[PDB]
Amino acid sequence: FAYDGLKRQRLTEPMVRNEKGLLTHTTWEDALSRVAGMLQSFQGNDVAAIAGGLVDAEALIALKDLLNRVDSDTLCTEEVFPTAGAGTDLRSNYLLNTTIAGVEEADVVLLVGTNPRFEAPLFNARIRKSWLHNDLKVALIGSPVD
Amino acid sequence: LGLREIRIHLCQRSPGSQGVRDFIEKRYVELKKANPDLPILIRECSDVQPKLWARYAFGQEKNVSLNNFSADQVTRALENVLSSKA
Amino acid sequence: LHHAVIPHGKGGRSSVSGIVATVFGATGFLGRYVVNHLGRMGSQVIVPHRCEPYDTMHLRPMGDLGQIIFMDWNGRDKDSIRRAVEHSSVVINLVGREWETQNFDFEDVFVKIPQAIAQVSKEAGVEKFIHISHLNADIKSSSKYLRSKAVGEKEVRETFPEATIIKPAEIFGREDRFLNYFANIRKTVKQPVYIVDVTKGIINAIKDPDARGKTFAFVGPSRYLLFDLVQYVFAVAHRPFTTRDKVERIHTTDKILPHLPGLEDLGVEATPLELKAIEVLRRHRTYVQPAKTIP
Amino acid sequence: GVRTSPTGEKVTHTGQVYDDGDYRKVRFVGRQKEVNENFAIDLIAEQPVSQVGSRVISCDGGGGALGHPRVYINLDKETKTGTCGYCGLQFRQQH
Amino acid sequence: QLITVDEKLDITTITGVPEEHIKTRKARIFVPARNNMQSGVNNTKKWKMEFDTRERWENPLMGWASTADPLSNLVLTFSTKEDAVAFAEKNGWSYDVEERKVPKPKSKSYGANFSWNKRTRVSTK
Amino acid sequence: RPTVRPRNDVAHKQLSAFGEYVAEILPKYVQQVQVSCFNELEICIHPDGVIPVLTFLRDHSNAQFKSLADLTAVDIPTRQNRFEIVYNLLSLRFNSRIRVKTYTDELTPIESSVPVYKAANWYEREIWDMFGVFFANHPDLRRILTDYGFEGHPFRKDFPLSGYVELRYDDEVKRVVAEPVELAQEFRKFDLNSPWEAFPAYRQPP
Amino acid sequence: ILPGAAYTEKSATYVNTEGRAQQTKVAVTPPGLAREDWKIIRALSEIAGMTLPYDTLDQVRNRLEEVSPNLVRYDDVEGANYFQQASELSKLVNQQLLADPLVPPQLTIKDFYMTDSISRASQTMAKCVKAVTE
Amino acid sequence: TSVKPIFSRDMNEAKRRVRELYRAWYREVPNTVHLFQLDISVKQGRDKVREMFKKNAHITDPRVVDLLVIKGKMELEETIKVWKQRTHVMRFFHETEAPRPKDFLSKFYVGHDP
Numbered sequence A: 001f002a003y004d005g006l007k008r009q010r011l012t013e014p015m016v017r018n019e020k021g022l023l024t025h026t027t028w029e030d031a032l033s034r035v036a037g038m039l040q041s042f043q044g045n046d047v048a049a050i051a052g053g054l055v056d057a058e059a060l061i062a063l064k065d066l067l068n069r070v071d072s073d074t075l076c077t078e079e080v081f082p083t084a085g086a087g088t089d090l091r092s093n094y095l096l097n098t099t100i101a102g103v104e105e106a107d108v109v110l111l112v113g114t115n116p117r118f119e120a121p122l123f124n125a126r127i128r129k130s131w132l133h134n135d136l137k138v139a140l141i142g143s144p145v146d
Numbered sequence B: 001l002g003l004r005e006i007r008i009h010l011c012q013r014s015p016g017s018q019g020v021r022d023f024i025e026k027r028y029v030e031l032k033k034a035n036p037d038l039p040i041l042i043r044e045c046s047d048v049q050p051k052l053w054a055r056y057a058f059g060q061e062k063n064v065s066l067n068n069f070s071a072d073q074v075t076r077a078l079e080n081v082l083s084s085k086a
Numbered sequence C: 001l002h003h004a005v006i007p008h009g010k011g012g013r014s015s016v017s018g019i020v021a022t023v024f025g026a027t028g029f030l031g032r033y034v035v036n037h038l039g040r041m042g043s044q045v046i047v048p049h050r051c052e053p054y055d056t057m058h059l060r061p062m063g064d065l066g067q068i069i070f071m072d073w074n075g076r077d078k079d080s081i082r083r084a085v086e087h088s089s090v091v092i093n094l095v096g097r098e099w100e101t102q103n104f105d106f107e108d109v110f111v112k113i114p115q116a117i118a119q120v121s122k123e124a125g126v127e128k129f130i131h132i133s134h135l136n137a138d139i140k141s142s143s144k145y146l147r148s149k150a151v152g153e154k155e156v157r158e159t160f161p162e163a164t165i166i167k168p169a170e171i172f173g174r175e176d177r178f179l180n181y182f183a184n185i186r187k188t189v190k191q192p193v194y195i196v197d198v199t200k201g202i203i204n205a206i207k208d209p210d211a212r213g214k215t216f217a218f219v220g221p222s223r224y225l226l227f228d229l230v231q232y233v234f235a236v237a238h239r240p241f242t243t244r245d246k247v248e249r250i251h252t253t254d255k256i257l258p259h260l261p262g263l264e265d266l267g268v269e270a271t272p273l274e275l276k277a278i279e280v281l282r283r284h285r286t287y288v289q290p291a292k293t294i295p
Numbered sequence D: 001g002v003r004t005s006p007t008g009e010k011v012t013h014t015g016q017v018y019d020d021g022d023y024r025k026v027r028f029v030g031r032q033k034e035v036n037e038n039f040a041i042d043l044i045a046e047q048p049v050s051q052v053g054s055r056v057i058s059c060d061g062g063g064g065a066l067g068h069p070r071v072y073i074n075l076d077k078e079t080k081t082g083t084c085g086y087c088g089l090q091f092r093q094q095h
Numbered sequence E: 001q002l003i004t005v006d007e008k009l010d011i012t013t014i015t016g017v018p019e020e021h022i023k024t025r026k027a028r029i030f031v032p033a034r035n036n037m038q039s040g041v042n043n044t045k046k047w048k049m050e051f052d053t054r055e056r057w058e059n060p061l062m063g064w065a066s067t068a069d070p071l072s073n074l075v076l077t078f079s080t081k082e083d084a085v086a087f088a089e090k091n092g093w094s095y096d097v098e099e100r101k102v103p104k105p106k107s108k109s110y111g112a113n114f115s116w117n118k119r120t121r122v123s124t125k
Numbered sequence F: 001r002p003t004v005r006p007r008n009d010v011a012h013k014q015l016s017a018f019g020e021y022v023a024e025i026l027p028k029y030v031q032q033v034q035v036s037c038f039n040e041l042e043i044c045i046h047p048d049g050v051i052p053v054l055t056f057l058r059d060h061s062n063a064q065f066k067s068l069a070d071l072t073a074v075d076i077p078t079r080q081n082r083f084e085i086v087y088n089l090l091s092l093r094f095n096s097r098i099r100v101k102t103y104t105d106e107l108t109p110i111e112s113s114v115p116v117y118k119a120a121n122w123y124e125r126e127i128w129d130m131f132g133v134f135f136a137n138h139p140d141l142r143r144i145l146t147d148y149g150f151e152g153h154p155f156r157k158d159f160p161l162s163g164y165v166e167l168r169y170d171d172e173v174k175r176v177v178a179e180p181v182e183l184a185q186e187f188r189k190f191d192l193n194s195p196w197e198a199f200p201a202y203r204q205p206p
Numbered sequence G: 001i002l003p004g005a006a007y008t009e010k011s012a013t014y015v016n017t018e019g020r021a022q023q024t025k026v027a028v029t030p031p032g033l034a035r036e037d038w039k040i041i042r043a044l045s046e047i048a049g050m051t052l053p054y055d056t057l058d059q060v061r062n063r064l065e066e067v068s069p070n071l072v073r074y075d076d077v078e079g080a081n082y083f084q085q086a087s088e089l090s091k092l093v094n095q096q097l098l099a100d101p102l103v104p105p106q107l108t109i110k111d112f113y114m115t116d117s118i119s120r121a122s123q124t125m126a127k128c129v130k131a132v133t134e
Numbered sequence H: 001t002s003v004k005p006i007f008s009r010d011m012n013e014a015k016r017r018v019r020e021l022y023r024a025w026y027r028e029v030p031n032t033v034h035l036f037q038l039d040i041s042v043k044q045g046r047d048k049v050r051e052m053f054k055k056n057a058h059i060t061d062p063r064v065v066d067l068l069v070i071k072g073k074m075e076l077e078e079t080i081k082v083w084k085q086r087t088h089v090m091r092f093f094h095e096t097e098a099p100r101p102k103d104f105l106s107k108f109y110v111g112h113d114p
Ligand SMILES: NC(=O)C1=CN([C@@H]2O[C@H](COP(=O)(O)OP(=O)(O)OC[C@H]3O[C@@H](n4cnc5c(N)ncnc54)[C@H](OP(=O)(O)O)[C@@H]3O)[C@@H](O)[C@H]2O)C=CC1
Pocket: C024, C025, C026, C027, C028, C029, C030, C031, C049, C050, C051, C074, C075, C093, C094, C095, C096, C097, C098, C104, C109, C132, C133, C134, C135, C167, C168, C169, C170, C171, C172, C177, C178
C-alpha cells in the first residue's frame, strides 16, 4: 500500500540554487555542468558519496567508478556494519547464510537485537510457519516485542 | 598511485579454484593482518574461473587468471600485486 | 517548467515538444514552413489570422488534433494581440508585405505592428520573441521597405531587449517572390537563402538559450551577380534568355555582416541554390551550367 | 454546484480546472468550456431518507426493469442510513 | 535436392522490422505468474514473450495515454521455453529467460486441525 | 435437445472412410488424417506432396474436387515450421469438402499450385504478401494487398497491429510521407482469459 | 538535485538479505525529466571528462560481474563459506559491550508504516499511522 | 541441417544473383529520376542503392540472400513499371524525418530510450 507515495513529492526536474540561494528548475545540461565543474576541481578525500536505502546496484557501481576516477574511496552507506576483523571481505559475514527457506529446517532459532515482525515481515512469517508446523523453538534477546 | 583494492573470484566446488580455496583457508587471515586497511573482497560464485582483480589509483584495473593455480602460485600472484603500483 | 510543457514522446506528430508558439503572419510564404516544422514535433501553435478562415486551411493538417488554434486578430487592436500571446512561451512575428496598400503602408507593417506585438508580448510575460527583419535593412536605403525594416528592427530591440532578431537575404522557395519573380520576367551581388534553411534556423533559435538577445543574418552559401542569377534562372526554366520599391530591393547588393552570427551558428547548413532551383522552377518549364559565383 | 477559480474558469463536477500557468486553457479562448451544471452529488443529497419497517429493504432504482439490478440493503445500524450502491437513495429503519 | 547450411538461422534482414526495434529491445521469456486474486491456474500453462516497457505520455488534447513504441502490445505464446528462445534468436532479439515457478507439493491433513499435543490444533472452525 | 447441435454419424463415417482411402493411395505424402466432431475431413501432408495430392483430389474419379474454395496460411510461432498452409477444396460431384494442410518456415519454398487450380494464383500472392511464404514457379509472385514498398508481412503473429510507419501529407515536400508510428491513444491490451479451464475434453497431458 | 527513477521505473538490481540477486522491470517510465539513476552518473562522467566504460544496461551489468560475479546470477543463492576465518579475525581485536539493553527501532505497529522516503510520502501509510495511534 | 534451396545452392551462386540485381538497379536509377521527376541527383539515387545493398553484406545464408534478391527484384519491378508513385520512391530518403541523435548524451537529454 505504499506505492501511492510514488505519486507525491516527486523530483521531476533538475534544480540548482539561484543567486538568492533557492532551488530553481534548470536543464539537464546546466545541472550536470555545475556538478562536473566541481568534480573536476576535487580529488581523493575531498569527494564522498552516501547511498540510501533504495539505491540499485547499477547506480551503486556507477557512482563508485566515477569517484574512483578522481581517486576517491569514500563510498559510504547509511546502514552501519562493523568493519572490524574481516569486515565485508567475506560475504558470509553479512549474509543470512541459512537462507529464508532454511528456517523451515532449523530446530532452534535465537533472535538477537531484532524485531523481525516489522524489520522483515515475510521472514517473521516464515518463522511462525516453522513454529506452527515444525514445533520450532524460538528464543529472543532484546525487548519483549510481540 | 598505488593499490586501492583487491578482489578474488572463485567457485566453491570446481577443481580449477582448488588452489584458491586452499589459499583462502590457509593464508587469507595472515595476509589480512599484514594489510589491515586494504579491501580484499573474496566473492565466491558457482562455476566461475578464478581470477584476481587489482584496482589502482584513479580507477585503473588489472586481472590475472588463477585457473588451476596451486596455493603457492596464488601466493605469488598475490605478492606480484601487493608490490606492483600500476 | 510547468508540468504541461515538459517534453514527451519521440519528437513526432503526437509528441509534446513543450513549445507553445504564437505565430503572427502564419498564412504567408514563411509562415507555412514555420508552422509545419512546429507541428511536426508536436508543438502547440496559435495562429492569429486576418484573412478568411478558408485561407488558413492549408495549415490544419500540420498538427495533431488540437495542436493548431486559430484566432481573429487586427494589427491595430492590442487586445486581439493580448488574447493571442498570453498563453504562449514564444512569439514569432512574420508579418510583412512586399507592397503598400491603402490601409497599411510599410511603416504600419514593419514598425507599428512589430512594436505592438513586442510590447504586448513583453507585458504578457512571454519569455521568447523572434522578429524577422532583413539583411539589407538600412535607414539610408533607396527602398522604403528596407528603411522601415531598419526602424522596426530598432524598435523591437528597444521594446523587447531579449528578442532574437533574424535578418534573411531574399529567400528562395516554391512560393517565393524571388525565383518566381524572375521567371515571370517577360553590379548587384545577391546571397539568397533557402526557405527551409531559414525555417530550420528559426526553430533552432527557439531551442537555443544563446539565441536570446542576438541578431542573426541568414544567408546562402554563395554570392552571385544578379545578371548571372537571372541568366541561370532562365536556363533552368528552359526559357529563351512588379513595383518601383521591389526593383530597388532586387538591385540592392546583399550586405556582408561578419560581426553577426548566421545559420551555421545555429546548426543549420546553408543549402546551395543549385540543389533547389529546379524544385522551384520546374513548374515554369513549358513541356544547365550553374551561375558563376562570386569567389 | 458550479464554482469558479481565481482565473475565472468553471470547475467541473470531477474537480477539473486548469491552473493559472497552464497553457492548455488557450483552447477556450474565443470559445467555451463545456461544463454540466447539474451536479449529481448535490442532486442525490436532496432526496429524503425513506423510512421503512424492516431490517432489510430492496432497491431496484425505480421503474422495474428500467432501473438497476435489485439489491438488498441491511438497516441494522442506527448510526447511519442504508445507501443503495447503485442509485444513492437512502433508507432508515423507523422506530 | 537439398543443400547444406550451417549458418545460425537469422532472419532479421527479411522481416522488415526497423533496426531500432531489433537491437535496442530486450525480450522477456517467462511463464506468467498466477494472478493472486484468483485460485485458477489455467493462465500459467504456456510460455510468453513480451518486450521492455517504454514511455507512455499524456495526450495534450484529451489526456489519453500516447505511445511511440510499436511493440508495446506484442505478446507471443510458446509451448516451451526452447521454442520461445529459438524464436527470439532467429529474430535477433536479446532476451532474458526466467525459469518456471511451480508450486511445491504441500502436505495437507485435515486431522492435524485437532492435534492432541501439537501447535497445529485450530482454535476455531 | 433444442440448444445442442445435432451430430451426424453417417457423414462422419463416410468422411472417415474416404480419409483412409486417400491415406492408402498416397502413403508417400500423407502424415495425418482426422475428422472433426462437426464432420470436416483434414489431410495433413508433407509439403513435397502438394502437387501430387492436390492433383489426385482434383482428377481422381472418386474425388473430383474441382473447386478450390480457399487457400490461406496460419502463423504459429511456437512451431519449428511456423506457417501452416491450408487448402479448402469442394467436390460438386460428391457434394463434399476436404481440407489439405501442410507446413513451411520462413526460408523454405512451397510449390505453387497454380498448375492444379488457376484460382490459386491470387491466394498465393496474398499468402506471400501477408505471411512471406514463397511459392516456387508462380507465374507472377508479388504483393497484392499491401502498399508499394511496404516492409514486413502483417499477418505474422509478431508483426505489431498498428505497424511501424504511418502516412501524412507534408506541405514542405508537397507529398505524402511515411514516418514512424505515434498514436495519440495507445491500443489498450486486455487480458481476457479466465484462469479456470473451460473444456476438459481438450486438456493436454502434463 | 538530479531527479532519478524509483524502483517501479527502472530495471535495476537488488540483493536481498540472503545474497540473492533480483532485478526489477520498468512498469512506468520516470516522471517529468527524471532519468535512470545509472545513466545520470554515466552522463555526468562524460561531461566531467572521465567517461565510464559502459553505455547500456547490459554493459553496466557486465561491470557488476567484474566486481562481484554473484550480482548477475538472478534468483540464485550463492553460498558463502569461511565463517572460520571470519571468526578468527573477529577475536584479535576486542571491543566492550555497552550497558544499554537491545531496543529495536520499531517496538509497535505505529513504527512500521513509515521507514523510507516512499512510505513517508504515502497518504495511505499516514492513514495507517493515524488509525493505530488514535 | 539439410534444407530445400530457393534458387541458389550456395553463396557463390547466390552472390551472382546479387550482382545481377545491383546492375539492374544501377542502370535504372537515371530513368527513375527522370520518370518520377525527382529532385535528387542520379548520384544520390545510386548512393542510396549501394547503401541498401551494403547493409546486408554480412549474410552468409544462401536462402536469406535469395529472398533479399527476390524482394529486391519485386521492388525494382514496382519502380520500372511505375506502380510506385513519387511518394513511394522518395520514402527511401526520409526527408521529413529529423536527425535522430546517436551518442549517449544526446539520447539522455531527450528521453529514456537507448
Ligand atoms: N520572403 C523574403 O524574401 C523575405 C522576407 N522577409 C520577412 O519575412 C517575413 C515573412 O516573409 P513572407 O512570409 O514572404 O511575407 P508574406 O507576405 O508571404 O506573408 C505575409 C504575412 O503577413 C501577414 N500580413 C501582412 N500584412 C498584414 C497586416 N496589415 N495585418 C496583418 N497581417 C498582415 C499576411 O497575412 P494575410 O495573408 O492575411 O495578408 C501573411 O501572413 C516578413 O516580415 C518579410 O518581410 C525578410 C527577408 C526576406
